Amino acid sequence: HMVVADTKSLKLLALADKVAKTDANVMILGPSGSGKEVMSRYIHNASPRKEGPFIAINCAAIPDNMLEATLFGYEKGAFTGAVQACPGKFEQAQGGTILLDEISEMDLNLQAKLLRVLQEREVERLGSRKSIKLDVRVLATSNRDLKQYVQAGHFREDLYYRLNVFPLTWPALCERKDDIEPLANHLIERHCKKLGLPVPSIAPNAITKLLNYPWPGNVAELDNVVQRALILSENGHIQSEHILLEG
Amino acid sequence: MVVADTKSLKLLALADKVAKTDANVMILGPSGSGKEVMSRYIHNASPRKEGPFIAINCAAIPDNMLEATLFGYEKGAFTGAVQACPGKFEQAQGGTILLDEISEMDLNLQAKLLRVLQEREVERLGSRKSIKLDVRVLATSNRDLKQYVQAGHFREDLYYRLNVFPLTWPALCERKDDIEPLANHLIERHCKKLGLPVPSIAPNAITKLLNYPWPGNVAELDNVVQRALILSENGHIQSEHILLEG
Amino acid sequence: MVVADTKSLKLLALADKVAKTDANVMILGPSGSGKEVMSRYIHNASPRKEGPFIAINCAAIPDNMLEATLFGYEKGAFTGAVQACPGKFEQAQGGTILLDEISEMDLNLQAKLLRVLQEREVERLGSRKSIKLDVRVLATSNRDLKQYVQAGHFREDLYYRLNVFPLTWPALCERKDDIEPLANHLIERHCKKLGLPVPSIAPNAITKLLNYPWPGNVAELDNVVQRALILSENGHIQSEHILLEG
Amino acid sequence: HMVVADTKSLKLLALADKVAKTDANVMILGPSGSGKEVMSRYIHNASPRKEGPFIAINCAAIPDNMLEATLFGYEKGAFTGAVQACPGKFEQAQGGTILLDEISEMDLNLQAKLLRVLQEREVERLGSRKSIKLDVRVLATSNRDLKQYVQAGHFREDLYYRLNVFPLTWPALCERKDDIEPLANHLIERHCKKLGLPVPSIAPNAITKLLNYPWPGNVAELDNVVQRALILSENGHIQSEHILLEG
Amino acid sequence: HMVVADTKSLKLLALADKVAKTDANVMILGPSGSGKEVMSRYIHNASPRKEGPFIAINCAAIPDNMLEATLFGYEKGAFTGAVQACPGKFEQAQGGTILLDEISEMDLNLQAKLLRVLQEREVERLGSRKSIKLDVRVLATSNRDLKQYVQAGHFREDLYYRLNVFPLTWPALCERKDDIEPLANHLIERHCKKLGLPVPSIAPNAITKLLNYPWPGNVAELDNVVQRALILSENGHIQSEHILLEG
Amino acid sequence: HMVVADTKSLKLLALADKVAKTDANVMILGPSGSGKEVMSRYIHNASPRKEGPFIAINCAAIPDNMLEATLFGYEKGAFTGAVQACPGKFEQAQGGTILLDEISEMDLNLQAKLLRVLQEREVERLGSRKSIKLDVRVLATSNRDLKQYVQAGHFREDLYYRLNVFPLTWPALCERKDDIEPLANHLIERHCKKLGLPVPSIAPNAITKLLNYPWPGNVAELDNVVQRALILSENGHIQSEHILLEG
Amino acid sequence: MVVADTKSLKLLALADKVAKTDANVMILGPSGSGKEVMSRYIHNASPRKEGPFIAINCAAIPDNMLEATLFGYEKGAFTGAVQACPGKFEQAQGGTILLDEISEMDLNLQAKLLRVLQEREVERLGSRKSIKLDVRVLATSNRDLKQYVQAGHFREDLYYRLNVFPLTWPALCERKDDIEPLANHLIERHCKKLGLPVPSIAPNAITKLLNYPWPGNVAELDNVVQRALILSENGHIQSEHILLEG
């Protein structure tokens, strides 16, 4: 789960705890990453719905234009290709929490649909006129200023406010450098756990080399550098020579 | 309908006058929930009080189903119409219908609405049969309709038919005396909905709310208030709990 | 029907001249409902007064059904033609038809109308059978048709055939002596259809109406009047009850 | 038909009398009007085919793009809409005269078909390979300088030469003011005769008022002014006040 | 057939006699005129195929884009409208001569099909894979510089050289004035014979009037002026007064 | 058969003899002509695949976009028009040599297919997924610089290197004047033999006229001049007067 | 593999360290045969050396069958699919697949590829059934992927998945000590597949080959070599047989 050390991150987890015990929609802003989903589950496991299902969907990763079809579901013959009936992600997240990752990639028409789901607390599959009563807690993320996206006319203003009741800005890695070392060691361990290998120590100069890199790719880039260093050290003591950043 | 500003009370005074009549009411101003509740205020003060109240947001209907929802359709009137379905005008029989954000209707859809208003009857899509209509019409626009007409995006004849009695529900910053009662209203109905006790708002917090221009109006006030309730852990809302934009 | 201005009376005097005949009357001037009441006046003053009077607005028919309603259509003449249907020309047999806003016809629709006027025959879309017509034709336009012809949007041959006896029904500000009698008529017919006793207008209210340029003409006057009746609560309309966009 | 008095118009009828005796194609030039057809009928009744049929078609007045279909005819199913077999206008004008009014409205493809009709003296209906022998004399009109229209590439040069064997330019009404008074009297007469009314006289001042108007609408406009004067005079003596022109 | 008198034309006919005796493809260039296809016929009847068929097709006059279908022929159903099988123009000109008039109107694809016909000396109908063996001599014309047309990418270079073995340029009427008087008389004769009328002569003053006109329409215009003159002269002797030129 | 005399031409035939013994792909460059095919035929007859089939296809002469269809072949119903099965040019060239004349006319997709054919030594018809083992030597031509064509992104680089293993640039006729006279005589020869005529000689002055013309049309243009001269001389002695160049 | 240049030897040394793992390898540099020779080296040095090795060039598949051949497809999944067909991933089960020139995939194919890497399972086109995959992934680009991501033509998330262990296989001029061993190698395999004795390369020819920049790299060297063998009549290759760009 969430492993931090920087004071700004600790403050952000503190806020995450306050909103967790409620049913408010959480908007996780900041650069795109995987932490956002690490917090989403954290919020879930801290919410009164910890035993409920946790469903995640990335609105910027679904090919063949099946974002709409995945969210709301569809009946047999709702569109060219719909060979079967299929429950939406909202249905699978009944009594639990759904995560709409990268929500800023929804077209204006899809937002108008999503708005109705939030308002009516009911969902209807594509090609269906039957509504489904919904008890689902909604989380969402965005790597861009939604307020300006509303101004640009690419996002609904009404939907914007309904989702920004409790925004949390999960910052880049360079703005929380105290998180780098705990995160680095965490990646080393979980990768050693995959292969039954003992976790190796990490050199001081290696750490200093990591702390002083701006990390434009954030956690995703850190995971690469670490995994790369583990290859170089052959799962052994990693030193500054094993740390190859874009420098 | 929670108001307190003297200019808002004047507006409710006008609303009480048209309520007694069957006149088309156009509620102007910025988009919001108020235009929706001020329309239902009129209904409950109208001779059609006990009648049905139908609302439709022309800027919120997905899949281009605005026309199909208003007038209804017969089976197979368009690709996807797998059943018969009455229009919102039919559902508003003997009562009131609200055409929220009416400026979103295309010129063709305006021509159909015009026919409905003048002939007091409606026809479903893919239907030749007219249905006699006894419906009081309310509408809403966040645009200057006259400027919209002159821009050639709105029918002039339809404009005058809907603009016999325009009420302009202003922005929240030009009716600041409504802000404190509104906030307490928003807190209450949110707490009641969640089965929680209603907290009060500290004097400093009120001052903080009154001096914000509210570019998002009521929709933003509900935001701030719901956020404050989370920060206050459902306790009394202090100035520290009110985050506006920074 | 309800005029008092000397230039309006002189126009109705001209209306009686053509009424006796079967000549095509072109009614020019601002887009209004007043044009239809004069065309009714022409009909009721014509030897076809006992015949039918059918009106059609060429700028108010949705779903591109202007051609379909004028000429009629057989079953399956177009995708949607689910039945046979007589045109507006057939219904006006032995009487008078009013082609309101005739400047909205596409050049192709004009060529078909020209065919009807010349041969005194009509044929439904889908049909090759022509129907002998005995119909007197009236038309309107808020547009300089001569200018429209030069702009290549209107047929020159059709123009001259309809411009035998052009009558220009002027704007409301160019016939202000009609304003006061018209205002009382709008009050009377509105109150009567709502079962309310008819109120009169205060002198100050009259002067206020006479000195407004009326960019919306009779359509706008009806708005202001109905608005005043709401404000006056069906009492005597005072100067304060008259809210125009000054 | 025909009512002239101007010296330049009398010469033009004199020319019409010469081609009438022949089978030559006549191109009637000048501004569009009814006079174009009444001279075509004058030629026909002065022609050896005077007992033959006279067929007229306005190429600029046939709706639904039925120009080609009306001229050549069509068998059942030649195009989407052909629910029957139908003879062409050329077939109807067999042994007589056909009038192609405003011929400059034909597309270059339609011209190519008309060309082969003039050359081979045969016509084929749309959707038919069966050719029909034709004994038809051809007349045509145009409000356009066909030579300029040829040079512009909108008209076939070869067709231009077959049709402009004997051009006759029926001028604007202002270039033949001596025709105005006889023409006005003709209109007053035929209207009153159509209603069984006695023909009224026309004041000298009314005549002079008509003579000094340029008539941009030519004969078509004159007919309007005359009718309007009859309406105003109540079929009575037309005076210099029943003549409403422009102002 | 050929009615010439100018030494310029006589030298061309002299050249025509040489190729006639051979099977070489003749390219007749010069302004578009009926004049050519008289030479094409002269070439044919002076050729060893004088008893064979003579088929002429004008590539710029075939309506409804039926150039390719009439030249190659089709089987039933080769295109929308083909309700039967139909031999091409090449098949009809078997053992004789075919004339491809205005060959510069063929699109690059049609040209590629014609090229293959010249090489393989066999043709296949549209919608047909069976190839018909041919023994046809090919003649062609063009009113434009084919070389320039090749450089403009509107004509195949290989096809150009196959057809331009023996190019004969049939000049404008003004560049061979001594042909005018004999041509004029021939146009009067064949027109007067066509209508069963006695053929008249042309006055000397009328002759000189014809000789000093540049003839931009060439012999299509000369045939026009003549037919118009015969109308005015009432089939009598043509005087200069009867000759109305466009100038 | 290759008839040359220029020292630069003899060098290319010397090179051609070296590759003929091998199985390498030969790219013949220079202006488009027929001499490129008679070199392919030469290379074939000098190759160990001499007795094998020689199949030639011009990629710039196949109408109706049937280039891809004729090369690879197709099964019944591979495209709208494929009414039967049909073997490709590669199949017909089994155990022999194929000539891809003007290969620069292949679209990038068709090039990617040809590349696979060269690599895997297999071909499959359109609409078929069964592949056919190939034993075919590939020769190709191009009237343009393939390197610039690759740089222009209109030709695959990898394919360019597979085809330009042994490029031979067959120059224009002006860069090898010593070939003109032997070529011209050869043309006079074979053009006589097809008619059963005795071969005539060509005057010294006439030869000199040939040598000093730049021949922008090369061999194709030379053949025209020769044929034209034979027509003018009536298959007799050719003099400088019979030689009409574009001058 | 040939290799003699210190640069290439260090790259192969790095290849050995990543071979023993299941990490995705990114082989960068100009397009050539050498990339797949390294991808095969990585395989034969990996614990999956006895497993299947599947190669697919994303820039060489005709008729847009890149997505189809990679993922596989059920019958009639697209207009052309007349049969079921397993994808390249299915064929590379328990072994290694090489996605050659991966920068040619469109953003959609990249999204599909991403899910395959994440979930370690694939589903054919027109199929809902997911196939569990034990497949090691190698990839190749002749393009700066980082820049390609910034240009918005490549997914950033997919980029970092593949950029765990990037290896840049340089141009032939940046590793000249490989030229001579590579040259003799190309002669050897070309002569052996043609049933000819292998010729040697003269000292003067070697230096002539060493001082050419090789913009076409190995593909050009193989080209130049094969041409030399023809000129040498399969004899020893002299500098006179080396035709480059003179």
Supply F213's token pair. 């013309």
Q: Report the 10 Å Cβ neighbour count for E80.
A: 5
**Which residue stretches of G79-174 are H helix?**
88-91, 107-119, 145-150, 156-162
The single residue listed with the structure tokens 């005029």 is C3
Distance CA G100, CA B126 (A): 55
Which run of H or of E encompasses G56? Answer: strand G53-57
What is residue E44's three-state secondary structure? Answer: helix
Supply A216's token pair. 């434009």
Paired with D73 in beta bridges are: D87
Domain-ending residue, one of C152, C172, C192: C172
Q: Does C107 touch chain D (CB under 8 A)?
A: no
Closest CA in chain C for residue B107: C62
Main-chain phi, psi angles of G172, to 5 degrees: -70, -25
What is residue D63's three-state secondary structure? Answer: coil
What letters, b where the CB count within 10 A reaches 16 and e where it falls short, cover C48-79?
beebebbbbbbbbbbeeebbbbbbbbbeebee
Which run of H or of E encompasses F9? Answer: helix F7-20
Closest CA to B60 of B5, B90, B102, B26: B102
G36 labelled binding-site residue: yes
Alpha-carbon separation of residue B104 from A34, A154, B151, E171 (angstroms) = 39, 17, 14, 69
User: Cβ(C145)–Cβ(C154) under 8 Å?
Assistant: yes
E223 labelled binding-site residue: no
Q: Are F157 and G219 a contacting pair at CB < 8 A?
A: yes
DSSP F175: G
Residues in chain E: 247
Closest CA to G95 of G58, G131, G134, G69: G134
* C87: CATH: 3.40.50.300
Q: Does C26 touch chain D (CB under 8 A)?
A: no
What is residue B229's three-state secondary structure? Answer: helix
Residues A103, A197 within the same domain: no
The single residue listed with the structure tokens 């003048």 is B118
Residues B114, B16 within the same domain: yes
Chain D residues whose CB is inside 8 A of the C120 CB are none
What letters, b where the CB count within 10 A reaches 16 and e where it falls short, cover E201-235?
ebbeebbebbeebebebbbbbbbbbbbbbbbbbeb
Distance CA C40, CA B147 (A): 34
Domain-ending residue, one of A173, A201, A221: A173
F3 labelled binding-site residue: yes
User: Cβ(F226)–Cβ(F187) under 8 Å?
Assistant: yes
Amino acid at B101: E
Q: Are A228 and G165 a contacting pair at CB < 8 A?
A: yes
> Chain centroid to CA F239: how far?
32
Residues A109, A212 within the same domain: no
Distance CA B183, CA B207 (A): 12
The single residue listed with the structure tokens 């325009």 is B166
G129 labelled binding-site residue: no
Q: Are E116 and F63 a contacting pair at CB < 8 A?
A: yes
Alpha-carbon separation of residue D97 from A200, D37, D66 (angstroms) = 107, 12, 21
Chain B residues whose CB is inside 8 A of the C223 CB are 160, 163-164
Q: Report the 10 Å Cβ neighbour count for B9.
A: 13
Q: Are G165 and A231 a contacting pair at CB < 8 A?
A: yes
Supply E22's token pair. 């051979």
Residues in chain F: 247
Main-chain phi, psi angles of D56, to 5 degrees: -120, 140
What is residue D111's three-state secondary structure? Answer: helix
Chain C residues whose CB is inside 8 A of the B157 CB are 31, 60, 219
What is residue E100's three-state secondary structure? Answer: strand
Q: Name E208's Cβ contacts closer than 8 Å, sequence gap at least 6.
A: none
D127 labelled binding-site residue: no
Supply C140's token pair. 């309107």
DSSP string, B6-74: HHHHHHHHHHHHHHTS---EEEESS-SSHHHHHHHHHHHTSTTTTS-EEEEETTT-STT-HHHHHHEE-
DSSP string, F100-155: EETGGGS-HHHHHHHHHHHHHSEE--BT----EE---EEEEEESS-HHHHHHTTSS
Residue E229 Rama label (left phi>0; alpha psi -120 to 50; beta): alpha
Please tell me which chains touch A, using 3 or more CB pairs under 8 Å as the contact test: B, G
Paired with G53 in beta bridges are: G96
Q: Name G114's Cβ contacts closer than 8 Å, sequence gap at least 6.
A: A61, G155, G157, G158, G161
Q: Are E166 and F228 a contacting pair at CB < 8 A?
A: yes
Angle at F12 between CA F7 and CA F15, to 5 degrees: 130
Residues G212, G91 within the same domain: no
Q: Does G79 touch chain F (CB under 8 A)?
A: no
Closest CA to E12 of E23, E32, E35: E35
Residues D219, D188 within the same domain: yes
Residues C177, C166 within the same domain: no
The single residue listed with the structure tokens 């922008």 is F216
Q: Are C222 and B160 a contacting pair at CB < 8 A?
A: yes
User: Cβ(D231)–Cβ(C42) under 8 Å?
Assistant: no
Q: In chain C, what is the straight-line distance between the N-terminal and C-terminal CA atoms, in Å? A: 30
Please tell me the distance in Å from D135's CA to the nearest CA on chain E.
13
Q: Name B211's Cβ contacts closer than 8 Å, sequence gap at least 6.
A: none
Distance CA A77, CA G121 (A): 26
Please tell me which chains touch E, using 3 or more CB pairs under 8 Å as the contact test: D, F
Please tell me which chains touch D, using 3 or more CB pairs under 8 Å as the contact test: C, E
Residue C125 Rama label (left phi>0; alpha psi -120 to 50; beta): beta
- Interface size between E and F, measured as CB pairs under 8 A: 38
The single residue listed with the structure tokens 């050519």 is E36
DSSP D59: T
Distance CA C50, CA F81 (A): 68
The single residue listed with the structure tokens 């690879």 is F72
Supply G89's token pair. 């991933």
Chain D residues whose CB is inside 8 A of the E225 CB are none
Please tell me the distance in Å from C115's CA to the nearest CA on chain D.
8
Residues G51, G162 within the same domain: yes
User: Cβ(E217)–Cβ(E187) under 8 Å?
Assistant: no
Please tell me the distance in Å from D82's CA to the nearest CA on chain E.
14
Q: Are E63 and D109 a contacting pair at CB < 8 A?
A: yes
Q: Are C157 and D32 a contacting pair at CB < 8 A?
A: yes
Chain B residues whose CB is inside 8 A of the A158 CB are 31, 60, 219
Chain C residues whose CB is inside 8 A of the D220 CB are 156-157, 160
- Bridging pattern class, strands C25-28 and C136-141: parallel
Chain B residues whose CB is inside 8 A of the A161 CB are 216, 219-220, 222-223
Main-chain phi, psi angles of C140, to 5 degrees: -130, 165
Q: Does G36 touch chain F (CB under 8 A)?
A: no
Closest CA to E221 of B74, D164, G18: D164
Rg (CA), chain C: 21
Supply C228's token pair. 């005043």
Amino acid at E92: Q
CA torsion, ordered F214, F216, F217, F221, to nearest 10 deg? -30
With 0-12 / 13-18 / 19 or more C-beta atoms within 10 angstroms meaning exposed / middle / buried, residue D175 is middle
Alpha-carbon separation of residue F90 from C102, D19, F83, F128 (angstroms) = 69, 70, 20, 15
What is residue E99's three-state secondary structure? Answer: strand
User: Cβ(C29)–Cβ(C171) under 8 Å?
Assistant: yes
The single residue listed with the structure tokens 């009169």 is C200
Q: For D224, which of C20, C115, C163 is closest by C-beta distance?
A: C163
Q: What is the 3-state secondary structure (H, E, C) of chain C?
A: CCCCCHHHHHHHHHHHHHHCCCCCEEEECCCCCHHHHHHHHHHHCCCCCCCCEEEEECCCCCCCCHHHHHHEECCCCCCCCCCCEECHHHHCCCCEEEEECHHHCCHHHHHHHHHHHHHCEECCECCCCCEECCCEEEEEECCCHHHHHHCCCCCHHHHHHHCCEEEECCCHHHCHHHHHHHHHHHHHHHHHHCCCCCCCECHHHHHHHHCCCCCCHHHHHHHHHHHHHHHCCCCCECHHHCCCCC
What letters, b where the CB count within 10 A reaches 16 and e where it falls short, cover C181-205?
ebbbebbeebbeeeeeeebebbeeb
Residues E38, E132 within the same domain: yes
Q: For B62, which of A23, A113, A166 is closest by C-beta distance?
A: A113
Candidates D120, D164, D168, D169: best to mutate against E (most CBs of E within 10 A) is: D164
User: Cβ(A167)–Cβ(A27) under 8 Å?
Assistant: yes
> Chain centroid to CA G41: how far?
11
Distance CA D137, CA B115 (A): 54
Q: What is the 3-state secondary structure (H, E, C) of F193-226?
A: HCCCCCCCCECHHHHHHHHCCCCCCHHHHHHHHH
Supply E86's token pair. 């139909």
Q: Are F224 and E112 a contacting pair at CB < 8 A?
A: no
Angle at G201 between CA G199 and CA G207, to 5 degrees: 170
E105 labelled binding-site residue: no
- Interface size between F and G, measured as CB pairs under 8 A: 39
Q: Does F113 touch chain G (CB under 8 A)?
A: yes
User: Cβ(C87)–Cβ(C126) under 8 Å?
Assistant: no
Please tell me the distance in Å from A223's CA to the nearest CA on chain G.
8
Question: Computed from CA positions of residues E6, E11, E12, E16, in that sequence, does the dihedral angle turn out positive or negative?
Answer: positive
Q: Are E109 and F231 a contacting pair at CB < 8 A?
A: no
- Bridging pattern class, strands F166-169 and D86-87: unpaired
- By 3-state DSSP, what share of chain G in percent is helix, strand and coil, each rounded to 5? 45, 15, 40
Which run of H or of E encompasses F73? Answer: strand F73-74
Q: Are B219 and A157 a contacting pair at CB < 8 A?
A: yes
Q: Does F82 touch chain E (CB under 8 A)?
A: no
Q: Does C112 touch chain D (CB under 8 A)?
A: yes
User: Cβ(E55)–Cβ(E99) under 8 Å?
Assistant: yes
- Bridging pattern class, strands F86-87 and F132-133: unpaired
What letters, b where the CB count within 10 A reaches 16 and e where it falls short, cover C101-118?
bbbbbeeebbbbbbbbbe
Residues B25, B66 within the same domain: yes
User: Cβ(B102)–Cβ(B144) under 8 Å?
Assistant: no
Closest CA to E189 of E164, E155, E223: E223
DSSP E22: S
Residues B182, B139 within the same domain: no
Angle at D193 between CA D190 and CA D194, to 5 degrees: 85
What is residue E47's three-state secondary structure? Answer: coil
The single residue listed with the structure tokens 């090898």 is F176
User: Cβ(F185)–Cβ(F4) under 8 Å?
Assistant: no
Distance CA D126, CA D91 (A): 13
The single residue listed with the structure tokens 């030229």 is G179
Distance CA D31, CA G35 (A): 79
CA torsion, ordered D28, D33, D35, D38, to nearest 10 deg? 90
Q: Does F62 touch chain E (CB under 8 A)?
A: yes
Distance CA E118, CA E111 (A): 11
Residue A55 Rama label (left phi>0; alpha psi -120 to 50; beta): beta
User: Cβ(D126)–Cβ(D72) under 8 Å?
Assistant: yes
Angle at D200 between CA D194 and CA D201, to 5 degrees: 140
Please tell me the distance in Å from F80's CA to the nearest CA on chain E.
11
What letters, b where the CB count within 10 A reaches 16 and e where it falls short, cover C216-234?
bbbbbbbbbbbbbbbbbeb
A33 labelled binding-site residue: yes
Chain F residues whose CB is inside 8 A of the G83 CB are 129
Q: For C223, which of B18, B115, B163 is closest by C-beta distance?
A: B163
Q: Report the 10 Å Cβ neighbour count for A28.
A: 26
Resolution (A): 3.1
Please tell me the distance in Å from G216's CA to the nearest CA on chain F.
8
- Report how many domains make up chain E: 2
Which run of H or of E encompasses B160? Answer: helix B156-162
Q: Are G216 and F161 a contacting pair at CB < 8 A?
A: yes
Q: Name B191's Cβ contacts closer than 8 Å, sequence gap at least 6.
A: B197, B198, B199, B229, B234
Q: Name C204's Cβ contacts closer than 8 Å, sequence gap at least 6.
A: C238, C239
Main-chain phi, psi angles of E101, to 5 degrees: -75, 135
Q: Does E84 touch chain D (CB under 8 A)?
A: yes
CA atoms within 13 A on the CB side of B199: 18
Q: What is the 3-state secondary structure (H, E, C) of chain A?
A: CCCCCCHHHHHHHHHHHHHHCCCCCEEEECCCCCCHHHHHHHHHHHCCCCCCCEEEEECCCCCCCCHHHHHHEECCCCCCCCCCCEECHHHHCCCCEEEEECHHHCCHHHHHHHHHHHHHCEECCECCCCCEECCCEEEEEECCCHHHHHHCCCCCHHHHHHHCCEEEECCCHHHCHHHHHHHHHHHHHHHHHCCCCCCCCECHHHHHHHHCCCCCCHHHHHHHHHHHHHHHCCCCCECCCCCCCCC
The single residue listed with the structure tokens 């802000």 is B179
What is residue D100's three-state secondary structure? Answer: strand
Residue A153 Rama label (left phi>0; alpha psi -120 to 50; beta): left
Interface of A with G in 220-239 (CB under 8 A): 220-221, 223-224, 227-228, 231-232, 234
Q: For F24, which of G61, G219, G226 is closest by C-beta distance?
A: G226
Residues in chain B: 246
* A182: CATH: 1.10.8.60
Q: Does D129 touch chain E (CB under 8 A)?
A: yes
Please tell me the distance in Å from E215's CA to the nearest CA on chain F.
28
Domain-ending residue, one of G153, G172, G191: G172
Supply G137's token pair. 């992934």
Main-chain phi, psi angles of F83, to 5 degrees: -90, -5
Residues A36, A149 within the same domain: yes
Which run of H or of E encompasses E189? Answer: helix E180-194
User: Cβ(C14)–Cβ(C167) under 8 Å?
Assistant: yes
Residues B130, B41 within the same domain: yes
Residues spanned by the domain of C74: 1-172
Residues in chain D: 247
Q: Does E171 touch chain D (CB under 8 A)?
A: no
Amino acid at A222: L
Supply B36's token pair. 């929706």
DSSP B232: T
Angle at C153 between CA C148 and CA C155, to 5 degrees: 85
Q: Name C138's Cβ contacts closer than 8 Å, sequence gap at least 6.
A: C24, C25, C27, C39, C42, C43, C96, C97, C98, C99
